[PDB]
């Protein structure tokens, strides 16, 4: 019976559900897992890079990207939708800086990206299907470090610690167990890397992960091979 109520994004099922939106939410899973953690010292993003074969130089699997000098976006889903939404986020941050001569709040930028993702089939904007990608915006603003999760349905919500991607269900419980409100950035990094090792196919070693941090201070930083090895030494 679920074959006539999901031919279009603008068709309601008897349960009053947007099955196409639900289907895109399901599509979210295919991507590699990402974990973001908020702490009073900042926010940390760690993503399981999923190199399908070596000889692929790592600077093309962009699961963590930079939004302005104060936010980082972790992606899970279609690379095309990832690129489109990342471009929108960057353009919106720069436009807000140009207009109001300030730095957009993480909540505001996530809201703008969600506003772009809202337009499903509205004949007034031209995408026609949900953006099969889930994003984690971790940044620093006047309200202290913050982290937000946005899903294809345009819904965004604050999250002091969240995980998305293929290892979403298995990592959410680990985050719940290991999370106490007060940590340090190093503690969050260690916990996130431990969870990644728990829910990663490969042995966690130097490459195959990416780690980024935004702190009330130095701008968004991508940990290089040296720091990655240093942390992996005593995860």
């Amino acid at each position: 019976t679920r074959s006539e109520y999901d031919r279009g994004v603008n068709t309601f099922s008897p349960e009053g559900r947007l099955f196409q939106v639900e289907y895109a939410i399901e599509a979210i899973k295919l991507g590699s897992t990402a974990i973001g953690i908020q702490t009073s010292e900042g926010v940390c993003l760690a993503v399981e890079k999923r190199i399908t074969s070596p000889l692929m130089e790592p600077s093309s699997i962009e699961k963590i990207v930079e939004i302005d000098a104060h936010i980082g976006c972790a992606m899970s889903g279609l690379i095309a939708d990832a690129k489109t939404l990342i471009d929108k986020a960057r353009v919106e941050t720069q436009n807000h800086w140009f207009t109001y001569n300030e730095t957009m709040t993480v909540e505001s930028v996530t809201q703008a990206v969600s506003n772009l993702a809202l337009q499903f089939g509205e004949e007034d904007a031209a995408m026609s299907r949900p953006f099969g990608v889930a994003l984690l915006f971790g940044g620093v603003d006047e309200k202290g470090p913050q982290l937000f999760h946005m899903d294809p349905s345009g819904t965004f919500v604050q999250c002091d610690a969240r995980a998305i991607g293929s290892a979403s269900e298995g990592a959410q419980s680990s985050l719940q167990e290991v999370y106490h409100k007060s940590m340090t950035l190093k503690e969050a990094i260690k916990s996130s890397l431990i969870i990644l090792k728990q829910v990663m196919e490969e042995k966690l070693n130097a490459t195959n992960i990416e780690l980024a941090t935004v702190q009330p201070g130095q701008n968004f930083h991508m940990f290089t091979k040296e720091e990655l090895e240093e942390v992996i030494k005593d995860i």
Binding site: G31, K49, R50, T52, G77, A80, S166, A167, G170
Partner: protein
Amino acid sequence: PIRALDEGDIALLKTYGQSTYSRQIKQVEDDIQQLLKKINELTGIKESDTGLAPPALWDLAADKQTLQSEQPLQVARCTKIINADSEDPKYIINVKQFAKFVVDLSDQVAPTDIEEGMRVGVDRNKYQIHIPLPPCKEQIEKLREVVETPLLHPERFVNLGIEPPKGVLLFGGKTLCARAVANFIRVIGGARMVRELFEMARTKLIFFDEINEVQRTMLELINQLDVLMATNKIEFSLPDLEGRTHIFKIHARSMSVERDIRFELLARLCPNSTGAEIRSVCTEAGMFAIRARRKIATEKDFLEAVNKVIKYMTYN
């Protein structure tokens, strides 16, 4: 530009190109085959024993006596007694693959206690019969709440004024889930069989598996009852991540596996699979370890089995 072979051409083809021992080789090979056939012919049948009992156990006296007078009888299931007409019962018989007849039987104790609807031995010529022939999630939580509680203390239902009913449909690991719920009435996936099941049941939660012989079975069953059907109101489907991990652990306990196995990771890698599929994955991991010639199966072997059994750059 195509020619036809000549007799001299083919003779030259046969002789010219050949090692000097070709003819002898063919002769010896034909000899081999013919002699093998001759040996097969001359085998000599090994006398097929008739099943005769060891000597000194035969009597031949009871044998002669039974041969002289044992009156072999044919087997047939009675269908009706035509109400027995009080006297002159006039039973009806359905000699299988042969015919249906009517009979008075006689020589037995009581026209009614003889038989009603079950096997009987009809005499050869006069069809008078002589002898009465003898013959895990809410998917389990709900079933628990509807069976086990009205197993040790069903009287609570009557205490509260509710009638505790029977009859639950296990539509959907159905078999072993039902067995665990029992932890017994085994059933096979006709009217005589269900009648027999009625007799066994009524001298004591009947686990029907796969649920006009069959129509008569349904009629008698419905009349008797007013039970666990196993079609394939509680529903059964695949388990979630934690259920798959639990099944993996349950089935990998009995293996020479390595110390630590990421069963959570394997459950994540194995979606939409069944319990039988999980069993197959574990067994394939075992054969993979054996192929590798290593006594201890590892996570690598388990992952290889997952890939082989259950089963790209646009999603990272």
